[PDB]
Each structure stands twice: as structure tokens, then as C-alpha cells.
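S.,

As promised, the HTD run. Input:
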Amino acid sequence: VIGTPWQKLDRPVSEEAIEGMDKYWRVTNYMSIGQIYLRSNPLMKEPFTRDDVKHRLVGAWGTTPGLNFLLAHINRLIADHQQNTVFIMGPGHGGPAGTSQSYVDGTYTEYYPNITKDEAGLQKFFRQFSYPGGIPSHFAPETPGSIHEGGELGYALSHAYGAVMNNPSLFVPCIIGDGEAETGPLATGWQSNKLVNPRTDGIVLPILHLNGYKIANPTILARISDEELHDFFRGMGYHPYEFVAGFDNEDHMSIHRRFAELFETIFDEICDIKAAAQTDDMTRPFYPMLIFRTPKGWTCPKFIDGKKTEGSWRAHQVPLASARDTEEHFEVLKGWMESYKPEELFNADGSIKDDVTAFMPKGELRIGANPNANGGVIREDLKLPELDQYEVTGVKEYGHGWGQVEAPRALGAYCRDIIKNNPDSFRIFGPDETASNRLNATYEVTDKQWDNGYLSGLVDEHMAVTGQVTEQLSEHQCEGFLEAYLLTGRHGIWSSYESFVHVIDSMLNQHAKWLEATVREIPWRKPISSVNLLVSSHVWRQDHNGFSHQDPGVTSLLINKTFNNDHVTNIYFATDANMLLAISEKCFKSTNKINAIFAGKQPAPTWVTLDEARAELEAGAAEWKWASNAENNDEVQVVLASAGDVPTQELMAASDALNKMGIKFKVVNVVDLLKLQSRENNDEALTDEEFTELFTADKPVLFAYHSYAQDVRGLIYDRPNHDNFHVVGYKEQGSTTTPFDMVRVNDMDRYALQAAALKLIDADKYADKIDELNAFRKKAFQFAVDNGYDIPEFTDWVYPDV
Amino acid sequence: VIGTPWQKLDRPVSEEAIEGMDKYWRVTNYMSIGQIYLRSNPLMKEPFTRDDVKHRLVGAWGTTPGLNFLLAHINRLIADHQQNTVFIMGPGHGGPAGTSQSYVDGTYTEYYPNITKDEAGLQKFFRQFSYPGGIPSHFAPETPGSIHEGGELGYALSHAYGAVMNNPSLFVPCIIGDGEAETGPLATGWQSNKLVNPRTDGIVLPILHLNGYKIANPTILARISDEELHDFFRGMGYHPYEFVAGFDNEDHMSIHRRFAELFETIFDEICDIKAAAQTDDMTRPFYPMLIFRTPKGWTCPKFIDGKKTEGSWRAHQVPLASARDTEEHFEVLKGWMESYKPEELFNADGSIKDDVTAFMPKGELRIGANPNANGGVIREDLKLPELDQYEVTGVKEYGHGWGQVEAPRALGAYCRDIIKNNPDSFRIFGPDETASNRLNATYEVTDKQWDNGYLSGLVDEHMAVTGQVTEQLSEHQCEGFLEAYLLTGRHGIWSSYESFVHVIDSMLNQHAKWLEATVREIPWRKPISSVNLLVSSHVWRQDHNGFSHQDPGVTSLLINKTFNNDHVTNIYFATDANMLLAISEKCFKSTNKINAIFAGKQPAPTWVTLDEARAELEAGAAEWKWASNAENNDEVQVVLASAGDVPTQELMAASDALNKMGIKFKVVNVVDLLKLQSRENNDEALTDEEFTELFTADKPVLFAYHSYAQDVRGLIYDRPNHDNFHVVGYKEQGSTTTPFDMVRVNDMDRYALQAAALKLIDADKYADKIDELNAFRKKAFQFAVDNGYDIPEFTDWVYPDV
Ligand SMILES: CC1=C(CCOP(=O)(O)OP(=O)(O)O)S[C@@H]2Nc3nc(C)ncc3CN12
Ligand SMILES: CC1=C(CCOP(=O)(O)OP(=O)(O)O)S[C@@H]2Nc3nc(C)ncc3CN12
Ligand SMILES: [Mg+2]
Ligand SMILES: [Mg+2]
Ligand code: NA
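Predicted complex:
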């Protein structure tokens, strides 16, 4: 247990805590300005001149003094209440507030020994911010205390609420920009309070940083009436509190006392809610939220060159753009830095004075030190059930190609038992698709958690105020809740219809960026569990839907995060349920990855046994010798290769026909896509020798790919024999139609694959056969048109091994 | 002018209109069930049996009777008030309500002559829905009345509000699913009422289709208290009205009278607001919105197999999944279809009776016929200013490589004058980035439109309650408002920082899908203006930002919509401002496209004159002969090729050095990326002959690409000499750093490009030179580290022609 969770003080905040908060605010404003502006002379020692100012002034001031003020108060709260706390910096361009917080709390020097608590360390700290060879401008993963960089705005609330799930002792004050709140993902994130339980989860306090402006405009929420703003937050299930300061001549000490009193009222309300939830965990409370209204750039010069800067969008980026080049800007910068009276805040040796930090929390309660902000320190391996009990044994009993299994059902049973063995640290998220994607065996041991109204057992089923599945119709929610659940040390999986994965392409990009930086150069940030995403209801089988819903292209996006041997991104094609089991076990063991797991949920053949799946997954791509009819690679006339359940089924059927014609070939299945890249691009890929062994040195390769052919063409560009691959993929063709028609119109159907193999082998010799196969495709299409279902010869085919 | 906009009735709805609405509701419910279930015998003529039921039951019933009810009432309103109206079907899986609406209003038979108003046309209409060779399951672009297919939920409100901008006579009732409202994009779409003006724009009525459920769960908004739900809509600037029906034994005629009375109250309020706005167009009104609470699947069987179906998520998809296979399901289907009493709704010849449609609107007021729902019928070409006045003449006066122009400033001046010439039909959207991306010359002739609070001219600048620029910090808003502005026949452009384009990858995918279907097989849906997106503040120059903000990967996504010679997607690299002018003119003339226009906003050289830019754009890729030093392709030792402003600058500098060494080369710039694809993949690309002429038959090609090398490798896979291309692109390397460092770490800097050229030519001979160039790169990096700015020899280089 960290600290003493949810304790009230029952005494006023001390005057000494008020004095310390004002010193914190002054010193963190001072050092945030130092980071932006100063390449040397951090204490302004004689002579202090333009030569001390950076040549490239970069970073963001406007949000920063508001964050510094909130961080003083959150620090005071954590210390007084001993409260286990992670904050979220929504406006992550306020990085200098977050580096300052860590430098003050002592974690910065602990993690970065060269940046010492003295004049020399302070000079280094100022120069390195947003500087070549230095540190980022945003609240990046290399900053102690961050689980959210906040460069791409919108995810602050989903990360806050995912952090508190199954984390009943954790408090997350979530600082949200008022520009940020105009984003879609932020706007829906407020609604998460219907999906958490006040007894079994922790508590988020949203704090709207209502500073009136974004970069070049006021914000929507800052200019609507007070009555609408309060109605809005009350309508989303919060009790809104509002603080206003900095717009008149109120002295700063008065402001601190008034805020501390308010923040104690609010925290008391949170403690009452946590106490009450021990007895009534079914009534959803109105959680407090805070409207924090202060002038953007607070405490900077009110006017610069005749233009209003404090209290304006003009304070957003870097005021005094001429601070190095003109004596006029320089003198303004000088008076601004001096207004914080740094001579009272630092000792002559440049260390921050003891009376600046005596109010601060200590040890693992520090923001920079709490292990929830470095969740791989808390993470334990899952207790995984044995895989063999889930195996589809039909392949071993009856033959390759057996049965009509819906592949994700096996992963559902596996997930069910993972939750049973790990009952508060593995969650399933889904955008109203968990049952649709066949993972609902999990409901045998837990419920979908819903903390909103119930009506009747005639409609409410597998649903309770606490449980380990969470659904909301928002991919942004599911992805953000999961990412934070992982970043604070837990585990899970979510599922999505494949084309809708693209709604969160940019969140996958941010998490891939977080992982890249981390595996490269942040070794104190320990490994977290992987994002595991079941990508199902795919392009080939969108029975109730249609053309608009056919887009397997997240493959292509994930290919753009496969560099530098980071190994943070995997693309897997689950050929069948036994392969899906073997991929899932590997994903659930893995850390510091995004794993995209492609699987079909439609009834489909099972091709491999579980032992075969384990070996083939490790290699990445495998010959299926039992399906090849060639003696060796020299006797091969064509390599039949596929990735994805549906291209594999069609390729297999083509192989059966090609065999019956006397054509010699081998069959190769590809599961771990990026293992096709060359070793130069991927030091864990197939060597050239292993790749030639599979694909031959010089025979044609027909490659039936689940997604856009582009992906495979680009990946194998420097591979031996790549000129001989003919890659058939989805090509933006389809409608709402039968299964045969969907493959037919992308030349993916067995008949067209058989034809393409023949064309690659001898187009002249097989001209007539190719015509007949293309006419069979029309006849099968006409059959579907006339009769309402596909031709039996197509649907009823079973591989001859069965 | 269409109809008589914003007129009140001042009399009760007639009883005859009530009778007609109930008949409409009954006949559209009946035909929606016919579309889902019946392959023949649409009037249930003796014998009606299981053999008439479809073999594959696909589609969505739950939303549909609620849409059918609203469409009866919206139709009655349009007819009585003569009101110019487009609706949005948020729950676009309710396609059968939308096809039914068009069949009833007569547009369906007008657009599709084979689907006649009689028993034979009705049989065809039922069979074709979601059927091979037939029509989509959703409200697709092939349905008269659709501007929004609603398969990927979330964009209903942004499309509604973009439809009404500059459209003061248009009314848009926007039907929003209650599941849909849990999405991010929908949640922020409510806030659009702060960005429209009640005098110069039209009016959206949001109607929340609060049917209590999504696919397998209740919805958040349906289970919160009434008091929170109303506070929520009042807090977002609406006057909420609520209707509840279908949960008790109230007779349907009573329900229609009560709704018609309510909808007249609401429309009266909208007319009052429109009248008042003629005098006070500065006060933002509280626009009505409607909470419509009715049982999901309303009028279907209450229980099926002992399970509650009406009023449940169980009604979402297809009830009676056994209707063809069991007599038990069949008898339930039969009694359900009969409950609507089709014998009163159709004549013996199968035509819909006259008394079913006498209340309906006629002519261009019909939902299916209104030209706002087929905006290419209304669209006129822009009155474009002459391009030559914007030209950067420095190239002609002083030489190739001249000056320090910020390229988008020229497009800003061009846009300024387009707005001047087209003052109510060309809009600019931006996510708080219009000024940042340098398009703010537009503010010389218009303002950012903001219909929310003002404070002071010290902060409010270039901002008014009416204007042709709209900004909100949401890419989903900017993209959705623009798409609808185009779909209703107007024009525009938006700009985004490049990495944030990925927030709306999936909206680009939906609009590309809409365009693909349309150019292929919907010739009555006339061409609309293109989506034009200025992609700027790119990967190479993110001065205040950092690693997290470096992702030019929308290229790769757009490559997945380049099929079938649809020609709906363009990727352009603006080499400089004159090229940006020539690309922009082409984009602003073009129709039925998405145009991604890549340009740097940092000060940069200008390479080509405007005449050169016009020719080179047309070809797609061009030798720059004035920069090549080789006599002919046989004397070329390496082809220096680039796409993007920054790779071009670095390649050019490399060319200067290579020339000074005595190396023979040619320079080729690539603007229209997809013109690199082969003719087999793109019938408008360079022929093989033109491609070899540029890139040689067999010399090495060093290709410096703005984005991920993967894209170019895949595109040129079947091109002559492709094995000799070495593509250098962004490779996930960077930090917050100087301009030289960002190119350096992706091997994109001039020194590394010069080295790579030497390596391709003779790695042994040039081993030492390559070492020296790689050491210069370290020295330049160390200089940046020590000094705070890049080495003068890097920054001060100008191409020798200047
Ligand atoms: C407009 C924009 C920003 C303004 C945010 O203003 P605010 O939130 O009120 O913060 P503050 O405390 O400074 O006043 S930072 C941002 N990061 C972004 N993210 C996305 C998703 N799209 C665009 C940008 C561009 N950038
Ligand atoms: C859950 C989901 C749907 C339920 C929508 O329920 P509702 O809106 O209450 O409609 P109704 O009137 O039927 O009750 S349709 C949908 N389309 C989707 N779009 C996206 C962005 N992600 C997932 C899906 C999956 N699909
Ligand atoms: Mg702000
Ligand atoms: Mg619903
Ligand atoms: Na090749």
C-alpha cells in the first residue's frame, strides 16, 4: 500500500505550507523560463547579458505557470494526505513544468546524476531543455513522473481513467487544456465516470486548465456562459467547482490560501465518496471536477511591444522572441526573471533552499518517484494457463483443413482463464464488439463493468458495477484506457473490427513513439506489458456491412514503426485458432510492444496443430510440407504463399486443384509479417538463406496477402528472388455480398489464384485453362445472384487431408 | 431559393397529415422488413412460405423503425412548411429506412428505372438490398438523399453543421445514434453551434435517437438521469426537448399527433431564431435539440424464443435468424409483416396507394431530390484569380535556389483572393493552425467566424460572428465540416501539422470510399469539389516540438486508395512556393478527389519559376537540366532524385558538392508521387519510356524522399531499373533539435546524401571521402551542441546559380 489513501486533514492548511507553495511556484516559474531562454548564467550573476540567451528560442510558456501553480498545490496535497498520486499533463507542451517538478522533488538528479542540485547542474538543466543533444520540449517519457507526453492532445482523460482502473488507492488529478477539450477524444473522455467503480477503482479529478486560449484563438469552453459551463459538467456526472485567480490585484499568498482551502473541500468530497463506496458501491456519485480559470502565461509581462501578452493567446509559445538580439527584449526578460526574486530561492552555491521544499512529499509519494508513473516497476508476469487445453485437436484427429471453428473463440477461452488467474490485473476493452468478435467466453468469470443505470434482467446480462471487461462505443476510449492500464503495470487486450482500427491510428503512433524512445535510451523506465489488439471482422467477411467497412490498412501504418531494430511493433496473421493461441501466448508474455493480431471470426478450417503453430510462429514463415507436392526447390514450378485466414483458405483450395493437374509446387504460410524484411532492416528477420530456402532462388512466387499488396512489395524490396513475387492483395473492391464474391472481385478467390499460378508458370500453354477458370468465376457469381447463396462446389470444398 | 424558408404554420397539423404519416411509417417498416428478409413474394400472395425468405439474412432492423418514424414526420414538416431540408442518418446501418424513403418519395424509380412502382419493382427492391449484384446495407452514396453513409459512426454532427455553413435557407435534422454519441468525434460535434451564425448559416436540429442500446449494451446517455441528460444539452448551448413513446399501450395515431405537435413547437422556435437573427446576429441563441426516446426495434415482436427483443440491444441486427429454416421463425416473421396491414397500403398491382403519399413533399423539396443532397448539381467552378501575380519572381531575376520564402504565404495570398472573388462559397478550416501554417493573408478580406463570447480588441483580432475561416482544435471537426461543405456544392481547403493528419486517417478513408463508389457507378451523383489539405509544419522542421510530432505517414495511407484507375487520390510534394501555386490551382479546379498538398512553412529556397512549375507538375516528375551536369543518360554516374522541400534542398547541396568533385549526374524532382506507379497500376502515370528517360535504364538512383522509404519502394516495384534505386526517407529518428541535426539522424543531410551517391558509384574508390563526409556530420552536430545553432557552412549555403 502506498501512503494512507483517502484521508482528510480536519485542520486548515498550515501557513508554512502556503509559504512553501509560493516558493515552489516562484522557483519552477523561474526555472521554466531558464529552460526556455538561457544557455548559461542561470542565477543571473554579474555580468548577465544577451550572450547568456539561447540562439534558438523554442518551447511553450503560456500553459506553464498555470501547471506550476497546480503542481505546487498537488505536491502540498500529496505530502499532507500521504496520497498515492499520478498526475496527467494534458497540455504536454508545458514540459518545463514537468522537468521543473522532478528537479525540485529530487528525482531528476536521482535519475540523471550529471544534472546536480547546484549552480553547475542548474546551468546544465537550463541549457539542455529543447536543445541539440539535450531533452524534449514536451513532458516526454524521459521525464520522471510522466505517463503521458501530451503532444497530440485529446487522450488525457482516457489515460487518467485507465490509470485508476483496478487501482483503488490511486488519485489522478488530470490537467486538461481548454483547447484540448475541443478535441473529439477529450470530449468523450469526460464520460468515463460511468465506467469506473468508486470502490474497486481509484479516483480521477479532472482539472480544466481554463486559461481562455489555445494558440491563436480563445477556447470554446472559456467563452460560453458560466451557467452553460456548469450545466455541461453536471450533465456529465460531475460536481463542478470553479476557481478564478490572477485577473485582478489579489496578492499571491491570498490566492494560495484560497486555492488550498478549495482543494481541501474537493479532496474531502473525494474522501467522502471513497468512504461511502465501501458500503454502497452501486450508486454512481457525482465526482468533483475543477474549473481552473487563470490568465494564460500568468506572471509574464502584461504587454510586450504594445501587445497584451499575459491573459492572451499571444503568451502561448515564446514571448520576447528578440531576447538575444535586442537590448529591449533582453531588459524585459531580465526584469521578468528577477520578478520571481531567485536570490531568495537559491543558496549561494545554486542549490534550491530547504525552505522551498520542506512542504514537499518524500520517497515513493513524490510525483517523479511514484511507481505508478513507471509501471514496469510494479508489473508482474501474468499467471498464464497452459495453452494445450485450448488446442483445436480436430487437425490431429481428422487432418489439416478440418472443421468450422470460429478462431477467436479459443482466444476467448484462454482470456477467460487468464482473468480467473489474474483477477484484478488483466482487462478486456471493446467498442461494443467484445461478443461480436467472439471473446464473450470471458463473461463466464467476470462481467462488463457498467456504473450507470440498470433496468431489468431481461436486458442487462453479464453486466455489473464491477468487472474486468469495459465497453464504450469509442476506439479512442478503449485504446487510451488500455494504454494507461499498461503504463501503470497491468495487462490486457482489446478487439476491433478491422477497418475501425484506423480511428486510432494516431494513438498507435503516439504509443509507438513512447516505446521507441523508451527502448532506445530510457533504461530506468522499466518494460511494460504490450498493447494487444485483436483485429477481426475483417475485409473479406463483412456480412452485414459493406464496401465502406473494408480496409485492412492498419498493416501499412504499423510498417512505419519498424526501424532501428527497436522491435516495438508486431504484425501477426493468425492462420487459424491454433496459430491464434500460439501468437496470443507470445503477445501476453511480451513487453514494450504493440502487437496487432489479425484473425477471422467467421467459421473457417483449422490448418495446423498447436505444436506446429508454436514452431512456425517462431520462424515467422514456414513451408507446409504436408501440402507441398514438390521433391525439392528445383522441382517447384511455383511457390504458393499466403498470409491471413481467408487468402490461406483460397490458396489451399488452389493448391488442391494445381496438384490434381500435375503442377509441382510448394506451400509456405506467413504468420509474422515483418520477419520478411531483410536483416539489414530487421536483425530478427529470416536470414537470406532461410528466406531462399522457403521462397526459392528463382522460381515464381504467388503471394496471397490479407491486406494491400503494397505492404509486401515494399518489405521484400532487397530480398533474393523478390522480382519473382506476384503479390495479390485487397484492391478496394467489394460490396455487401457473399463470401465468394468478395474474394472474386479482388482476384483472391481459389480460381483466380489457380489461374494466376498457371499464368506465372506458362501463360501460353495454359491460356485455355485460365479462360475456363475465369468463366467458372462468372458462373459462380451468377449462381450467387440467381440463388442467394454461393455455389456448393465453392462452399462445400474441404482440403483432401481431412 | 428552394421553398419558403423558416415559415411557421400557425394552424394545427391536419388529421389527414396524421393519417398519411402513420401509413408512411407502416409502409416503410413493411418494406424495410421486406428488404432484409424476402427474396420473392413481397405482398405475401398465396402461397407465402419459407421459400420466399432469403438464404443469407443480413442488415440491421433495430434503428430502422425509429428512423422510419422520424422520416414520416420530417417529410410532413418539409411539405407543410415548404422547407429546404437535408437529413443526416447517423445510424447509417439503418439503410433500409433511407432506401424506403426514396422509393416512397419517387426518386428511387426516377434514378433507378428498373425498380418500378408496382409488384414487380417491389419484388426487385426487396431482393436487391444487401444482396450480390444489388445495393449496400448502409445509407450509401448510391441512395438518393444521402450525403453521409454512417457506417463509421461519429461524423454526423460535423457533416450536419458543415452542410449549413453559408447555407442560410437549409434545415438539417441530424439523427444521431445514442451509441454513436459515445464516440469522440460525435461528442465534440455538439459544440459546433459556437461556430455557426444564425443569420448567414442554416440551422441544424440534432435529434438524439435515444433507443437505449447499441449492439450488445445499453448506451451511456440512455441510462444517466433525465436531469443530467438535460443539463448536458443545455450546457452545450441547446434547448433540449424530449419525446418519449412506444413504451406503453398508447395508440400510434395518438403518438403521431403528440409528436407532430412537439415538432411544430420546435420548428416554431427555429423560425423565431431565424427571424430574430435578421436583426441581432451577434447573440448566440440556444438552438433546440430533440431527445427522441423510443424502444429499439419498435413494433417488432416483443419476445422471440423467450428473449426480450423490442426495447433491447437484441433488436440491433437481424431478428428471427431462422426465418427461412424453421416454421417457428417463419410464422413469427409472417405475423410481424402482417401487423402493418400491407393490404391497406398497396393497390392490387403492388403500387403504394395515393393516400399513403398525399402528405409528402414534391419536386426538389423531396429528401431524395433536394440538390443539396447531390451538391455537384449546385456546384459552380470557382472564379480563380490569375496565378502569375503570386509568382516568386526571385528565381527568374536572381537564379534557381534564391531567397528565404515561406512557401504557404503564396498560397495564403492566392486563397485570400479566391475568397474575395467567391465570398460565400470557399471556406478555410484549421485546427487552431491557420496562422501557424502561414495562411493568414486570408484575414485581410474575411474573419475567423466565432459565435461565442468576445472580451476585448486587445485579444479578439480577425474574428467576427460571421466570416469564411473556421477554427476549432479538432481535426475531426475541420475535416467533417469541409467534407459536407463540398458535398453540398461548395469549395475550400484546410491545413494541418503533418503528424496530426493521422487523427483523421479514417475520415479520409471514408471520404475516399464515398468517392470510389461514386466515380465507378453512380453517374447521377454529379462531381463535387475536392478535399484540399495543406500538410505542413512537417517531420523535418518541428522547431518547438519534437520526436513525438514526426510522422509524415499519411502518404502511406493515401497509397491504399489508388486503385482501379479511379483517380480519387493525389499526393503532391510542393518543391517551393511556385510549385505550391501550380499544384493549388490544379487542386482548386479538380473534382471528386482528395488532394494532399505537402509543403514546408519554414524559410526555404525557391527552385523553379511558375512556368517551369506548371510544366513539371503536369509531367509529375521532371529533370532539372539546369542542375544536371551530364551530357546524356549514358554519361550519368548517378541519378539524384528527390521529393519534398527539405530532401530537395539537401539533394541540391549534395549535387553542388558532387559537381565540384567532377562526378557526372542528373537531377530529377518528383512532385506528383503516384505518377511513379506503373501504367498497369495507374493509367495516368509516366509511361515506362518516359520513366526510363528520367531515371535511366541502368544507372544507380539516389532517391531522397520526404516520407517513409517504404512508400517509394512499393510504388516502383514493377518499374524498369527499380533495383538500382536507393531510397532514403524518414526512419523514426529525431528529437527536439536543430534543422541540420534532424536531417543528419535520418541520413538525409547533404553530406550523407553526397556520401550515399559516392557509395553507389564506387564504394572502394571513395572510401576515404565517405569517411571525411561522415566526420564532417559529427563536427557539425558538435558545433550545434556547443554553440546552440548550426554551423555557418551548413546554414549559409546558397545554390551557385543565385
Ligand atoms: C493547437 C495546438 C495547441 C493549443 C492547445 O491549447 P490548450 O490546450 O488550451 O493549451 P494551453 O494550456 O497552452 O492554453 S498545443 C497543440 N497540440 C495539438 N494536438 C492536436 C490533436 N492537434 C493540433 C495540435 C496543435 N497544438
Ligand atoms: C458498435 C456499432 C454499432 C452500434 C451503434 O448503436 P447506436 O448508434 O445506438 O445505433 P442504433 O440506432 O442502432 O441503436 S453500429 C457500428 N459502427 C461503428 N462505428 C464505429 C466508429 N465503431 C464501431 C462500430 C461498430 N458498430
Ligand atoms: Mg488553453
Ligand atoms: Mg441506439
Ligand atoms: Na527488383
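Chain A touches chain B through 137 residues (CB under 8 Å). The longest strand of chain A covers residues 171-177.

- D.
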